[PDB]
Amino acid sequence: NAVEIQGVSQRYGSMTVLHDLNLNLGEGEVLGLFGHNGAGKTTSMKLILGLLSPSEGQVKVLGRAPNDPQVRRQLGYLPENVTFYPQLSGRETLRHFARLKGAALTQVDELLEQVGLAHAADRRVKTYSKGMRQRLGLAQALLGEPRLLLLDQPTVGLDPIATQDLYLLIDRLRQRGTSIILCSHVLPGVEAHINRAAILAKGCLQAVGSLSQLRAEAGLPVRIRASGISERDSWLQRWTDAGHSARGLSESSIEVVAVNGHKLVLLRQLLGEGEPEDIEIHQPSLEDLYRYYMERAG
Amino acid sequence: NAVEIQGVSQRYGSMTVLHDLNLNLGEGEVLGLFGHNGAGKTTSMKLILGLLSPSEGQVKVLGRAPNDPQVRRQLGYLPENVTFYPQLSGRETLRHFARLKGAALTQVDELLEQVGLAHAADRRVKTYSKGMRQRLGLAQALLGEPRLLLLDQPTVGLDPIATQDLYLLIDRLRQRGTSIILCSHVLPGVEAHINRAAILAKGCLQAVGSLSQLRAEAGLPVRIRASGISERDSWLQRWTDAGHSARGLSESSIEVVAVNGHKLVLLRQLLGEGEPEDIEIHQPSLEDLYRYYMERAG
Amino acid sequence: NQVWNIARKELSDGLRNRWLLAISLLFAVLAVGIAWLGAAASGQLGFTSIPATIASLASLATFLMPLIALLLAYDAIVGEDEGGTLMLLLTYPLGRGQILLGKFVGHGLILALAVLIGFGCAALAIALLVEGVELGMLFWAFGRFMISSTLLGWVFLAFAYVLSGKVNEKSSAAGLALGVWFLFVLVFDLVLLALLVLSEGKFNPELLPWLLLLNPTDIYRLINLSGFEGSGSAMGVLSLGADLPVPAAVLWLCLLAWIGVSLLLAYAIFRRRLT
Amino acid sequence: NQVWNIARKELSDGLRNRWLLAISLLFAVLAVGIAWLGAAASGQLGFTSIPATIASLASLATFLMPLIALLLAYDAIVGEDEGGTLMLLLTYPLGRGQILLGKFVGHGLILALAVLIGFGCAALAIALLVEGVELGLFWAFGRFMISSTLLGWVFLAFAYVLSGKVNEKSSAAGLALGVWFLFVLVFDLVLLALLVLSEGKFNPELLPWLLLLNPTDIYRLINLSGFLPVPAAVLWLCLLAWIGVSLLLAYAIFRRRL
Ligand SMILES: Nc1ncnc2c1ncn2[C@@H]1O[C@H](COP(=O)(O)OP(=O)(O)OP(=O)(O)O)[C@@H](O)[C@H]1O
Ligand SMILES: Nc1ncnc2c1ncn2[C@@H]1O[C@H](COP(=O)(O)OP(=O)(O)OP(=O)(O)O)[C@@H](O)[C@H]1O
Ligand SMILES: [Mg+2]
Ligand SMILES: [Mg+2]
């Protein structure tokens, strides 16, 4: 019961950008928005913030209207291209932001240490790099007591260690009962830390739900990279006539695509004829799910 | 051959940002600058150009001083946080940059339709989104013949299909012998297109070479994953005592991590009693190499 | 309210920018130059007759101060939008009007502290180094001059906010600010005078004295010249209305009313700004 | 060279923005104001005589045109650096000098086109509205065009000089008034006081040359010859030298911006 969107349609000039986008989130649920580059990920987040007023739709933000600043009291947002005042000290910038949000001065230094920027604090934002500015934005997001935390493309600029640390932070905040709307373009690594997911192409919302239902309905086949299982053509002709797609690379490798829905028993036969030199089985990944659903819209 | 970083270091006023960097690349050599958030990757990337002057040593580019207009003529730069004049349309921006760069003025439209911004043209950069902005920056980067391209953090803000297309474009450019000093932090999937990868932390270029060469310089275990295959305890007791490092996860599965050499004879056991309800084989990828190098040497 | 936080960050910008030094140093150079280096137009090099300095200095101020206020404030709203920090700030629990008033109080305190500092070097500069001035008249005259100058600074600040809320880009904001600056000083006087001289030989004699209220630059000049200052003979423009717009608090109320209506206009425009 | 690309870039910026309709119309409203409403002090009426409306027009031009220049090229350099776009442009095969020269040429063509359109509209208004007093205006108003344009260029170059050193656009304006303040107020007042201090011993042979050291004084000498020790040609050459040294200093400061 965190955000309740009633079929919002938003128009920018004469160009519609959203049409009947009905979305919902639970109080403690984490929803991963994904979509095309020009779909509406950021604009939908901006509507959630209350920056723009939907022409056709009554959004409910934290069970209240988004115009009220009481919502923004316990709501945090991390903007993409998070640009900051370039002549304020990072410590000074974050202290000013806390003063705006009301958070205690004890929190600021501890939180700067928590993100991993205290070492390079006290130097102006201009000196920081694209990463440290992203980390300052992340520190802004975690500032205060955030009941509802809206992240926009948030791993942009961070390290794999920093990305996974943020992922654990998001999981912990889910444990604490906070609400997260995370939109990202690095689909790898977000399947574990995202409960519910939504995919939207153009304006219409393609689908919504947790990973399990979204995977099940698509029935997306599994991909198996292989290199020298038994021979160059031993494993090809046993599946070309078996009604299964299998393209045989010239370098003594066969790449078969199974369905992984009901033929789980056949997986035993898959690796049991001859000793294989190299096998690399990749299960149906949410990025492949994104590719499938984009192929559905168009 | 083309970019020779020999014996250089850079310091701001009182802080040494870059220490003893020696980087040598050649024609058609996809190099990568990987490192911790704030490790000097960008300051070195800028040092490739005339934006920064090397405090110590010299940075040969195309055999000439990088400050010569001639050197920049056969070069392309996609800067992280690409920022464009946000009042004139994308068509206007591409025409302008090509006019300073040197183009037929017909390559502009070809790139604009090629990058998928054809509909968005005329709309103006402010109304553009973070993605299309990054796509327009990439389209600018591909104006002319990019003898030496310098795409920095280029994958941020792009669709998975869009970043896949960008990687395919990197491959195509690598086919026609154009250098690319990649620096993207998105770790999964770059290594395939990376001819030579260089992980440099805050200290220095403590790692340089090809992914296969780096993988050799360091022994890395192979990754095996499962989710509820047979039982929780039987797998643990069977694999811990049989001279192996079995990571005993608590989700009704014992994901056993091999030495990366025993797996060739381990598969025979896996087919024996290990029914394949769920089996994932992932070779030690660039994530593992990055963690190894960063933690052990940093 | 949270208004003080935004005013605090604006004051911090004032110190981290050469603005506070620049505004106060140049404004004090203005003040000191008129007293010693000034009056050299007649050849009498140095004297500090309080009626003269607070009138010549008053005119040089009615030109300088609006321009300084406009330069400070034109990019308060448009500058944040171009910087990319405006969209972030609105996400905070701050009303659009609340941040507008915060920026207004911040810039106003910048210019008020600046004028106080600058004349504080001036006020001592006369008192200590002059020969036999009646300190009381000096004090109340420069007091009226300080408060009038800071009030004119505030009204032109508010004009800068309204134009900035109207505009889309920094350079166009500067152009409109320059237009608003030029209009009041050089055109609201000239067109109004021309109005009497030809449009009004006997067309409507009674209306011209009061209309000088519309322009804050004229109100400011009348307040600082008329005063309690002796030998109060007003030349052209002011003399019509120097004699009687019936005030001594009416001009002050009208100037504050201009600041008020302008702040309401800025709140109205800035509310509808986006899209 | 190829600075023309940057020049058309800010030409498009000026046309897309509201300067051209607020700088040319700025002169249009005042010039007709000074020519018909400028004798309103004792008798409102028009085109008293060409050299009359020229004197007041030049006097207000000194006050305002420098100020327009300082308000057109303070954000010119530092503004791009704040926007983060300057560095991407510095990646291109242009170099430090060509960027500054191109922006200067573009902004100078902005001011020149504004002067032409506005004072030309005023001149055609003088011709049509008023009697055929004289038309061979051309020498007076044309010299006004050239002199005002060169004054705008020299203060534009000063604005580039100050901008290339400031690191925050807001601070750039503070050092923009200073340059405007020094030439408008400080120079005349301080020079007059120094003459008063030196009663008869200032060596008046070197006062006209000290007047050269202020572009405003040069511009006011130029439009005061309707019918001096300093030749008119030298009176032009000195303003040209001011422009040259100002641009040289701006290029010198810009090279070490980062
Ligand atoms: N002009 C500057 N003055 C002072 N310090 C600077 C300046 N530019 C960068 N730095 C600092 O130098 C260090 C190295 O920056 P670096 O080049 O690693 O940025 P980066 O590579 O973009 O970081 P990342 O890519 O991980 O986001 C950082 O501490 C950064 O804040
Ligand atoms: N202020 C605006 N005026 C007009 N159109 C706008 C505006 N802001 C956004 N748009 C439109 O919204 C779309 C881009 O915003 P959107 O939310 O799709 O970005 P996004 O999907 O987050 O992009 P990315 O994920 O690549 O950062 C385009 O149709 C764009 O023209
Ligand atoms: Mg986005
Ligand atoms: Mg970087």
Residue range A3-216 in CATH 3.40.50.300:
yes
**D45·C13 Cβ contact <8 A:** no
Report yes or no: A146 and A76 within 8 Å, Cβ to Cβ.
Answer: yes
**Residue A176, Cβ density class (10 Å: 0-12 exposed, 13-18 middle, ≥19 buried):** exposed
Which residues from C are below 8 Å from B125, CB to CB? none
From ligand 1's centre to the CA of B88, what distance in Å?
A: 30
A175 CB-near residues (< 8 Å, 6+ apart): none
- The 8-class DSSP code of residue A221 comes to P
Of A161, A35, A152, nearest to A82 by C-alpha is: A152
Host H or E run for residue B22: strand B16-25
Q: Give SS3 for D196.
A: helix
Q: Give SS3 for B154.
A: coil
Report yes or no: B179 and B28 within 8 Å, Cβ to Cβ.
Answer: yes
- Packed helices B90-101 and D4-16: angle between N→C axes, nearest 10 degrees: 160
What string of DSSP letters covers A18-38? EEEE--B--SS-EEEEEE-TT
**In this structure, how many other beta carbons lie within 10 angstroms of the beta carbon of residue D128?**
7
User: Which of C12, C88, C272, C275 has the highest number of chain A CBs within 10 A, making it the mutation to test binding with A?
Assistant: C88
Nearest residue on chain A to C92, alpha-carbon basis: A72
- The minimum-distance atom of ligand 1 relative to the CA of A130 is 27
Residues with CB under 6 A from ligand 1: A 120, 127-132, 157; B 12, 17, 37-43, 80
Q: Does A120 appear as a known binding residue?
A: no
CB B130 less than 6 A from any atom of ligand 2: yes
User: Which of B82, B126, B127, B133 has the highest number of chain C CBs within 10 A, making it the mutation to test binding with C?
Assistant: B126
Where does chain B have alpha helices with state H? 41-47, 69-73, 90-101, 107-114, 130-141, 160-175, 190-193, 211-217, 234-240, 263-272, 286-297
N residues, chain A: 298
The number of the ligand nearest the C-alpha atom of A44 reads 2
Q: Minimal Cα–Cα distance from B87 to chain D, Å?
A: 9
N residues, chain D: 258
- The minimum-distance atom of ligand 1 relative to the CA of B153 is 25
Residues in A 77-96 with any Cβ partner in D closer than 8 A: 86-87
Of C218, C234, C82, C242, nearest to C155 by C-alpha is: C218
Which residue's C-alpha comes closest to atom 27 of ligand 2?
A: B130
Query: What is the b/e burial string over A235-268, where b = at least 16 CB atoms within 10 angstroms of the residue's CB?
Result: bbebbeeeeeebebeeeebbbbebebeeeeeebe
**What is the bridge-based pairing of β-strands B148-151 and B76-78?**
parallel
Strands (E), chain A: 3-4, 8-12, 15-21, 30-35, 60-61, 75-78, 148-151, 179-183, 196-200, 205-210, 222-227, 246-249, 253-258, 278-282
C-alpha gyration radius of chain D: 20
Q: Token pair for residue B285?
A: 């990828």
Report yes or no: A219 and A212 within 8 Å, Cβ to Cβ.
Answer: no
Q: Which long-range contacts (CB under 8 A, 24 or more apart) does D241-247 make?
A: D242/D154, D242/D157, D242/D215, D242/D218, D243/D150, D243/D153, D243/D154, D243/D157, D246/D154, D246/D157, D246/D158, D246/D160, D246/D161, D247/D100, D247/D101, D247/D104, D247/D157, D247/D160
Q: Minimal Cα–Cα distance from D98 to chain B, Å?
A: 11
Of B46, B45, B82, B89, nearest to B157 by C-alpha is: B82
Q: Token pair for residue A198?
A: 């939504």
CB B159 less than 6 A from any atom of ligand 2: no
Report yes or no: B56 and B8 within 8 Å, Cβ to Cβ.
Answer: yes
Of C163, C172, C256, C183, nearest to C213 by C-alpha is: C256
The number of the ligand nearest the C-alpha atom of A37 reads 2
Q: Token pair for residue A177?
A: 């009962």
CA distance C170 to C79: 6
Q: Token pair for residue B192?
A: 């395939």
Q: Does A55 touch chain C (CB under 8 A)?
A: no
From ligand 4's centre to the CA of B79, what distance in Å?
A: 9
- The 8-class DSSP code of residue B82 comes to -
**In this structure, how many other beta carbons lie within 10 angstroms of the beta carbon of residue D164?**
23
Method: cryo-EM
Q: Minimal Cα–Cα distance from B86 to chain C, Å?
A: 8
Chains that touch C (3 or more CB pairs under 8 A): A, B, D
The number of the ligand nearest the C-alpha atom of B35 reads 1
- The 8-class DSSP code of residue D144 comes to H
Q: Token pair for residue D249?
A: 């200093």
**C178·D26 Cβ contact <8 A:** yes
From ligand 2's centre to the CA of C96, what distance in Å?
A: 23
CA distance C245 to C251: 9
Domain boundaries, chain A: 3-216
**B162·A287 Cβ contact <8 A:** no
Report the topology of domain B3-217: Rossmann fold (3.40.50)
From ligand 4's centre to the CA of A157, what distance in Å?
A: 7
Report yes or no: D162 and D175 within 8 Å, Cβ to Cβ.
Answer: yes
Beta bridge partners of B280: B225
